[PDB]
Amino acid sequence: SQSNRELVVDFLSYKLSQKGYSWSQSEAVKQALREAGDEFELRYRRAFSDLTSQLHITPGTAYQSFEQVVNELFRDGVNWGRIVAFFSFGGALCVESVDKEMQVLVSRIAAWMATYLNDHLEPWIQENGGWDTFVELYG
């Protein structure tokens, strides 16, 4: 149970409840990410909703859709905004999965997110002041 895993789970659990799904499977960091994710989704509502709906999620295409969006997202480098988009995207992927009755994808998307965070985002996060800097700038 890594810190990145706990962050992904708090974000996804929040997002699923915000979208009508009751449960399940720092607090300052978590609250900041919840708010930044809400702000991102409201800022790009229509285009964000079109992106996720247009993917047409299936247990077999979910990973490639995730990989393709994430890869394109961090093409020109990492920044706090794109990290917010990544959590938001993953969040939209989980709700979409529960909406379409493919709830088996929820913990799968959680793993792919925790893995991508640990492997390709943790260094940059540390080099750009850690999560405490994110709470200051976005929370």
Ligand X SMILES: CCCCc1c(-c2ccc(C(=O)NS(=O)(=O)CC[Si](C)(C)C)cc2C(=O)N2CCc3ccccc3C2)c(CO)nn1-c1ccccc1
Kindly list the residues in this chain that would bind ligand X in the complex (CB under 6 A). 36, 39-40, 43-44, 47-48, 51, 69, 72-73, 81-82, 84-85, 88-89, 138
Compare residues 43 and 100 and give the one whose CB is closer to ligand X.
Answer: 43
106: closest CA among 134, 66, 75, 46? 66
Q: Whole-number minimum distance, CB 134 to ligand X, in Å?
A: 10
Q: Whole-number minimum distance, CB 117 to ligand X, in Å?
A: 15
Compare residues 50 and 119 and give the one whose CB is closer to ligand X.
Answer: 50
Q: Whole-number minimum distance, CB 3 to ligand X, in Å?
A: 21
15: closest CA among 52, 56, 55? 52
Q: Whole-number minimum distance, CB 105 to ligand X, in Å?
A: 17
Distance CA 97, CA 134 (A): 29
The SS3 call for residue 6 is helix
Residue burial 27-37, b: 16+ Cβ < 10 Å; e: rest: eebbebbbebb
